[PDB]
Symmetry: D2
Subunit: 330 residues, 4 copies
């Protein structure tokens, strides 16, 4: 197995942890964050969104025992001090949100790890990879990024549409669940004033680099897509609303058929396809990073259409972080 250390035990770190338990190719052997082992165990056991942990959790000698396996727990602020080699870590899932450059993340490698996956968009030239879009472009780099949840939804769908019909131009909106960066009542948010406004009370316009980041994982789409977000009062699951103008005429039936073909073929397990009367909670726990909603989309004409795709912004992204870890470890 690939031995993995998780840096940061926020929503992504904890859902990565849960998603890892079912895999045979990877084992989590260590977690680092500014939390006691007892508090870590509590956060793992009980989850408002995803329910009780499926398995056993005990604290012994200041470390965790999960499904009978020992997991080293540390609280180091400085990544260079993590002593990853002491527990034989191969790959670090870097999930704090604080170390999204080569200089910062590389400290994991100084500390004994072989490779690092950032669980957010890199802030420098560190390459990004999105399953279904460009895992095949991985070129042995020791530090990589899995981009963001919204990019993991938009890119696989954009690729299918562009490959079959040619995207001339597109504009995207994500209607996005509330996240940890938001506030329960109007409070300070110096760099994002709207995002400080009470989350349960409001539809809140927000920026997203996702559509543009698609141009990084799919260079053929560079400059052809951009977008924005609205944060709304749900605790999880989000939806992409993609409006595109197409080079080749395609009826809505042709579009449905092309997406369904991908979902059952090349992009199975990444891209999903439904014709059911679904709502966001139907995707709580969804592993596919993009589930096309056939009945929700609408075409104005054969060259101008609005497509709708769901994503569990916690679960899909977290599973694909693990997919990328396995991928770079081949």
């Amino acid at each position: 197995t690939i031995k993995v250390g998780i840096n940061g035990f926020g929503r992504i770190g904890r859902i990565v942890f849960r998603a890892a338990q079912k895999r045979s190719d990877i084992e989590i052997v260590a977690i680092n964050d500014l939390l006691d082992a007892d508090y870590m165990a509590y956060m793992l056991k009980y989850d408002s969104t995803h329910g009780r942990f499926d398995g056993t959790v005990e604290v012994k000698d200041g470390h965790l025992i999960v499904n009978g396996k020992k997991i080293r727990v540390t609280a180091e602020r400085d990544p260079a001090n993590l002593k990853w080699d002491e527990v034989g870590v191969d790959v670090v899932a870097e999930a704090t949100g604080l170390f999204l450059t080569d200089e910062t993340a590389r400290k994991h490698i100084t500390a004994g790890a072989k490779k690092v996956v950032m669980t957010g968009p890199s802030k420098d030239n560190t390459p990004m990879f999105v399953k279904g879009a460009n895992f095949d472009k991985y070129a042995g780099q020791d530090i990589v990024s899995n981009a963001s949840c919204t990019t993991n939804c938009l890119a696989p769908l954009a690729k299918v549409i562009n490959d079959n019909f040619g995207i001339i131009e597109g504009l995207m909106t994500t209607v996005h669940a509330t996240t940890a960066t938001q506030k329960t009542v109007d409070g300070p948010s110096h760099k994002d004033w709207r995002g400080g406004r009470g989350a349960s009370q409001n539809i809140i316009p927000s920026s997203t680099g996702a559509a543009k980041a698609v141009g990084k994982v799919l260079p053929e789409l560079n400059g052809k897509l951009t977008g924005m977000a609205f944060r709304v009062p749900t605790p999880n699951v989000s939806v992409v609303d993609l409006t595109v103008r197409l080079e080749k005429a395609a009826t809505y039936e042709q579009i449905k058929a092309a997406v369904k073909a991908a979902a059952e073929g090349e992009m199975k397990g990444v891209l999903g396809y439904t014709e059911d009367d679904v709502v966001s909670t139907d995707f709580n726990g969804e592993v596919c990073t993009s589930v096309f909603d056939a009945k929700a989309g609408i075409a104005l004409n054969d060259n101008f259409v609005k497509l709708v795709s769901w994503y569990d912004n916690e679960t899909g992204y977290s599973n694909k972080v693990l997919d990328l870890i396995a991928h770079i470890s081949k």
Copy 2:
């Protein structure tokens, strides 16, 4: 003053009632619904969304006294039996949702009213009117419709954009507050399965005829716009997200300037314009039916842009119902 009777005391009937109190051109003299006078008074006095009624409410002899004025209260199922002439009603605000055809609505005129305004889209050829779009096309008809809240947001903005730059084609999404037709927990909704799913828990895709209805109030846009909705867990205020391809190149600055010009001129009081860091609650109580959000929109290029406009789906629409009543009574 124009004497008005309200049929139906649901959200629109009650907010129409409140909005009328500040006007000098119109007086509400009668309300009909299947509710006691005491229960009517209760629903008027206390409102979760809009706060306490600003004024006095008393029940006397089975009727209402509001701000010292007597208001006849009846509970007739059959519009033909409403005896509107007995209280000198000029115009009926038909707000039950049940009488959206000429045959049904005309019964108000049989009962002694002179004209009728439906507070929803007509279901037959009854003409629709939207302030800012086509009030000037009113041709003395005795029964009319004020269309819907979403159409009142989309049409004024669409007209400004089309008049200045030429809309080749557009697709719209409304991110829309929860309404009375929805359910608190998953329950039966035979004709709209998704709309039966628990409203506080879900983003729910929903249909809307609004974009197409724009083609009815602005014939020049017939066939060029369509759209869809997502219902989200907020109790009021919604937002239009309009993606358009333009005939004439226009920078985002040109677009902002054109909307601001309308908001300060021809469409003052209908179309609004802001550059502030607003969120949906900032429009709770908004009287403009469309408030353009400059900072939230985004252009991909000079001919392809996404525009954002807010509307209080209760208050703006209700004020414009009254505007239409005054308009047809000139």
Copy 3:
């Protein structure tokens, strides 16, 4: 197995259905409600609160096939016309909310059923039974009631406390999740004005007969307990807050120990006990009808204490409906 027919496919009918699938003593063979088979299948498959159905659902020839078993689907308004004998139904779970008297419910027996369990408090002298409190008092009656969800939480806890320390008097509050009887925005609720007010926006005081109904399943407590409710904006899981004056002095530790003893003994599977830092979502899916929260309670002194117990108002109650069906079928 006991063959069961469900009348009414609302929240209780559907969660009863799901909870039955794991049992070996009971099989659901028929469902009746004013819903198509296709719509029934949809409501079974997708649940906002409890996630996707664990198993297979198909519609064939206007009936359902669930986990490979055929289930007759009908839409009869009149219980006497249900033809329960045609599918060999032993016991009816009467979950419509409409037939809570002997006269009405007995029509199930005229139609060929042997016994009936109402899934709500009876409205006449039909006896009520609550597991942990008085199943042992069942005396072969053909029509019974499982009381209500709140009574199923309060009664087992009240019995433990009274049996060990003697309840002189108590007053209860339930902080209760939003239910189907409530409204998404302020709307008509002629017989319960507060309960018509928008559910997602409000704390709403509400009546409950639960504390008094305890006096029916535990006659020794008749007249000694009453209470009230507050409905709050959560979609499921509620909590009892019970304030009692005790005859025998008992420290809080003694109280904890007595509840834990019951939870591990006589009342295992009915009454639960936790000392963890739990919140309501931690009980979504809880099968125990009452889970005592040790850390949340507080004693003023050895004879006056406030005790806190959680219940999943859908799941616990539904499992105990099935328990009562098995019990009366012994």
Copy 4:
């Protein structure tokens, strides 16, 4: 007028500011917090809970002009450096939550203020005062505390009940709106694990010192009251549920009459009384710190009763902070 400086521009600081505008006895002349003047102006202008500021707000030369009055804006971390004498501040409203002892708060007086009101419970022996309970006990002290919002609700009601009927013992629950200390999704809360759980998803048991603090403002009740809280998914307005055993027999009618008498007399403007079918949003903006809900309460017998009283945890408390400022400045 009394010149007031506000330290901290969180929910209490901002609602204090708004509530001050209508007063003639007090003027706010200065605000200090780690926020730009432009950001301060934004937070003042738009409020999700209380709507748009009623008046004018401009930023000039790095300070604020509000309703035509200049307000000095500073960003000093150290209270001793506040230079309150430079703007002639008489009293400081200390609303940061960080300086709740004599040592810390007194630094405002070193910096030129004459007196200080903490807008939260003191953490040392600094005396607390609650209008309706013990303003009359103020003995000229230069540093005081207005206690907490829950204490301002419980104490006036407790005093009326005790003065008329004698409280032998009581236990209180507050069902309390979400606050700024809570989290939008499950996140770290090292000293309060439950309070880190997602606020919009959960009923969350929480501690409160309020009932015990009543014993500080009303020494006759020392040791006779304690309580707990449940935080629920509403953005504002909370409710006290007080269960008391009484020395003198009192029917519920006697209790209602005694509370109504206080609300119309000695405690007018502090304690309110309603018999209407109210819900929490009906108190959004409520100035009374305790509004008795006659119809919601319930008596088991003449000596054991549960009483219900509403409070806008932002607005009532903030108005009474100002009342205390005026009181100590007499």
